Structure 1
Amino acid sequence: SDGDTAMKAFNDTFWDPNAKMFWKDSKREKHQDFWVEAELWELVMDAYQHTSDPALKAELKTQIDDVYDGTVAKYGQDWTNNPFNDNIMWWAMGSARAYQITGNPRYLEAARDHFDFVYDTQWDEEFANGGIWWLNSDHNTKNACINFPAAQAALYLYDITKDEHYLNAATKIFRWGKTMLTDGNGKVFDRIEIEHGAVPDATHYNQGTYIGSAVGLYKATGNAVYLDDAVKAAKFTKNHLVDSNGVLNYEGPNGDLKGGKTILMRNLAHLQKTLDETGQYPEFSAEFDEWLAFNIEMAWSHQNSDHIVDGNWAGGTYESWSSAAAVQALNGI
C-alpha cells in the first residue's frame, strides 16, 4: 500500500483538477513547468502499472488522459514551436508510454510526429561526429538530456510499431552517446559544447536515461554489452552520486535538477527488473537491491504528516518536482 498512499498524497497536495495540471508547489500559485509535467505524467503511469487497487488504477488511468488534455489546452498539440528539443522529446517519450497503456492512437501520433521532428532534423553528423542538438533555435551544444531520452523514445516506438527504423535510431543515438557523452565506465557527461568540448558533470537524471536506454537496447538486441553498460552506470551512481551514508545526493538549488532522482529511480527500477528476470550480475543485484531499499526507507522516514517527502532525502512549502522522487521510488517493481 505504500506506493498507493504516496501517489494519493501527491495528487491530494499537487494535482489541480480544474486546470488538469500539477501545481509547481503547495502554495498553488503556479503550475508545473512543461518538461517536468511530462515526468509527472510518467509518474502517474508508473503508479497505474504498480497498483493492485482496481479503483485507484481506474482513477490513475483517467488521469493519464487528463494530464495530456490539461497540457494541450495550454501548450497545444504541436510542440515543435518549443525551441528545446528535450522539452519536445520528454513529451514524445511520455506519449509513447501513454499509447502503450491506453491503446489510444492519438498518443502514438504525438510520439511519432515529435520524435521524427527531432531525430530527422536535429541529428547532425558533423559537430562531435554525431548527436542531437539541445535546441532547434541555436546549435551550440549536444546534451545527454536530449540524446538518451531520444534513444528511449525510439525504443518505445520500436516496441510499439516493430519498424526497424526506430531500433536503428536507438542504436545509432546510443552508440554516439556512449562514445562521446560517457567515460566508458558509467559516468555520463552533461553535454558537449561547440568551441569547447565535453562538460563532464554527472547528474541523476542523465545517469537514469542512459541506464534506461541501455536496458531497452539489451532487451531489443540480445547484446549483453548493453546490460554491462547499464550496470556500470548504476555502479557509478551508487558510489559517486551519493552522500557519505550512501543516500542519493540533493542536486538543488537548480530547479531542473532538484527533482532528478525521479527520473533516476524510474530507470533504476528497469535495471532491477531485468537483473531479477535474467539472473545476471547476481552479486551486484543483491547489493543494488539493498542499497535501493535503504534509500527508499531513509527518504520515507522524512515524510511529513501529509505523507509528502521533500527531495532532500538526507534531511513549509513543498514542491512537486522535488517531492515526486519519493513517490516514484514506491511505484517501481
Structure 2
Amino acid sequence: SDGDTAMKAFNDTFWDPNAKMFWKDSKREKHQDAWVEAELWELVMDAYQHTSDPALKAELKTQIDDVYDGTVAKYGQDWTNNPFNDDIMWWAMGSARAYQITGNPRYLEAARDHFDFVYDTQWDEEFANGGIWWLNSDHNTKNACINFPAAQAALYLYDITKDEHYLNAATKIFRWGKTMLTDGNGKVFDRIEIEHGAVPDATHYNQGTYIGSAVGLYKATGNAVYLDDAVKAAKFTKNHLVDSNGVLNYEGPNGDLKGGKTILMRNLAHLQKTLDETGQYPEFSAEFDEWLAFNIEMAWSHRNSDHIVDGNWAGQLLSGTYESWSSAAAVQALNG
C-alpha cells in the first residue's frame, strides 16, 4: 500500500537506528523535539496497525519498543520533573497505546504514573473553574494541548484498566474543555490565560485531540452528544482550517504547528470509522469521506522522488531540507 511506501520512506529519511530516535530533518543533525517524538511514536504504532507487509509489520513492532528506549536513554524514565505538562501527557498517552499493543507492564506504569502526576497535581479549580495548567513550573495558562490529550490518555487508561476513575477523569476534563475552550459549536480555542483571557485561535492538532476525546467518550459512555461534538469540530475543521481549494492549511512557520495535521488526521480517522460503522450523520459522512480522500490524494501527489511529502500539501514540489514533523502528516494520512 501507499501507507507502507510512505512509512518506509519516512524511516529511510528520518529514522536514526543508533540513537533509536527520529532526526528533526533530512540533514540528520539534531534529533526531534521530545513531545513531537511521542507523536512520531504514535505514527509508528498507526502504521504497525495498518500494514500487511510481514517484513514491515515485524520491523514496526520492534520500532515501537525502540522509540521508547531511545527516548528514555536521552531523557530518562521519570518525566515528572519536566516543566511542560503537555510533553508529559503526550508521552503518557503514547505509553498507554504502547501498553495496548505490547502488553509490557513498563508502559502501563509509564502511562499511569505520568497521567496521575499531571491530573492529580495540575488540575485546578481556582482559575477557569477547572482545567489542567500548561506548565508545572509556572501557573499562567490552561491549554487545549494539555487538556484534550489528557482526556484521551484517561480514556486509554480506562480501556486498559476498566477503572471508572479514569472515565470520570476523562469526562470531567472534556466537559470543562468544551465549556471553557470551545465556542460550543466545534471551534476549539488554544488556551485561556490568567492575564489575558481566552485566546480563540484554532489549529489542527487541537481540533484533532478534541475530536479524538469526543469519539472516545461517545464509545465509553454511550452519550451521543459526544459524537455530535466531534462532528461539529470536524465540520469546523473542514470549513475553516483549509485553503481556498479545501486542502488543509499549512500551519508553519511555528514549529509545533507545522506537523499538526499528523495529529488531526490520526483523530479524523477515528471519527470516519465510527460514522461508517454506526451509519450516523450519513450526509456529513459522505461529504467528510470525500474531503478526506481529496486531501490524502493531494498530499500523496506532493511527494518527492524519495516518497517524502513536505507539510505544504498544496504547494510546489521543493528540494532541499525536509523536516520529520512536517513530513509525518502525509504518512499518517496514508496509514488511516
2-structure distance, mates of 1:307, 1:152 = 31
Q: Deviations over 1:165-211 (max 9, x none)?
A: 00000000000000000000000000000022110000000000000
| 2:328 counterpart of 1:324 | yes
CA shift digits 1:248-285 (9 cap, x unpaired): 00100000000000000000000001001111001100
Superposed structure 1 runs of 4+ greater than 4 Å apart: none
TM-score, L = length of structure 1: 0.99
The Cα shift of 1:20 comes to 0.2
**What stretches of structure 2 of length at least 5 have no aligned partner?**
none
Which string of whole-angstrom CA distances, capped at 9 and with x for unpartnered residues, describes residues 30-63 of structure 1?
Answer: 0000000000000000000000122211110000
Partners in 1 of 2:184 and 2:162 — Cα distance?
30
Q: How far 1:126 sits from its partner (Å)? A: 1.3
**Superposition deviation, residue 142 in structure 1:** 0.2
Aligned-partner Cα distance in 2 for 1:103–1:5: 28
Residue 125 in structure 1 maps to residue 125 in structure 2: yes
Distance 1:106 1:38 in 2: 16
Task: Give the Cα–Cα distance (whole angstroms) in 1 for the partners of residues 168 and 50 of structure 2.
Answer: 31
Partners of 2:224 and 2:113 in 1: how far apart?
A: 31
Structure 1: gaps (5+ residues): none
Q: Residue 183 of structure 1: SS of its match in structure 2? A: coil
SS at match of 1:269: helix
Output the CA distance in 2 between the equivalents of 1:323 and 1:126: 40
CA distance in 2, matches of 1:15, 1:54: 20
Report the RMSD for the aligned CA atoms in angstroms.
0.4
242-251 vs 50-59, which deviates more? 50-59
Q: Distance in 1 between matches of 2:276 and 2:300?
A: 24
> 1:215: how far off?
0.1
* Partner residue in 1 for 2:207: 207
Distance in structure 1 (CA, Å) of the matches to 2:299 and 2:158:
35
Find the residue that maps to 1:198 and give its secondary structure: strand
**1:299 positional shift:** 0.9
CA distance in 1, matches of 2:166, 2:189: 24
How far is 1:15 from its partner? 0.2
Q: Secondary structure in 2 aligned to 1:280?
A: coil
Counterpart Cα distance in 1 of 2:126 and 2:74:
36
Are positions 1:100 and 2:104 aligned together?
no
Q: Deviations over 1:280-300 (max 9, x none)?
A: 001100000000000010111
Cα separation, 1, equivalents of 2:187 and 2:230: 11
Q: Where do residues 166-245 of structure 1 align in structure 2 (5 Å cutoff)?
A: 166-245=166-245
How many angstroms apart in 1 are the aligned matches of 2:53 and 2:216?
28
CA deviation after TM superposition for structure 1 residue 306, in Å: 0.2
Alpha-carbon distance in 1 for matches of 2:137, 2:69: 27
> What's the TM-score once normalised by structure 2's chain length?
0.98
Superposed CA deviations along residues 54-87 of structure 1, whole A, max 9, x for unmatched, are: 2211110000000000000000000111100000
Shift of 1:308: 0.2
After TM superposition, give the deviation of residue 330 of structure 1 in Å: 0.4
CA deviations 1:89-120 (Å, max 9, x no partner) are: 00000000000000111100000000000000
Matched length:
332
Please state whether the residue corresponding to 1:80 is helix, strand or coil.
coil
- SS of the residue corresponding to residue 95 of structure 1 reads helix
3-state SS of the aligned residue for 1:127? coil
SS in 1 for 2:72: helix
Give distance in 2, aligned partners of 1:40 and 1:151: 20
After superposition, the C-alpha distances for 1:106-153 in whole angstroms (9 at most, x for unaligned) are 100000000000000000011000000000000000000000000000
Distance between the aligned counterparts of 1:32 and 1:196, measured in 2?
Answer: 31
SS at 2:80 equivalent: helix
Distance 1:169 1:33 in 2: 28
Hey, what's the Cα distance between the residues in 1 that align with 2:55 and 2:325?
Answer: 26
**Farther-moved stretch of structure 1 (134-143 vs 193-202):** 193-202
Q: Secondary structure at the match of 1:18?
A: coil
Aligned to 1:263: 263
Secondary structure of 1:192's match? strand
Q: Any idea what SS the aligned residue of 2:142 has?
A: strand
- Larger CA deviation: 168-177 vs 191-200: 191-200
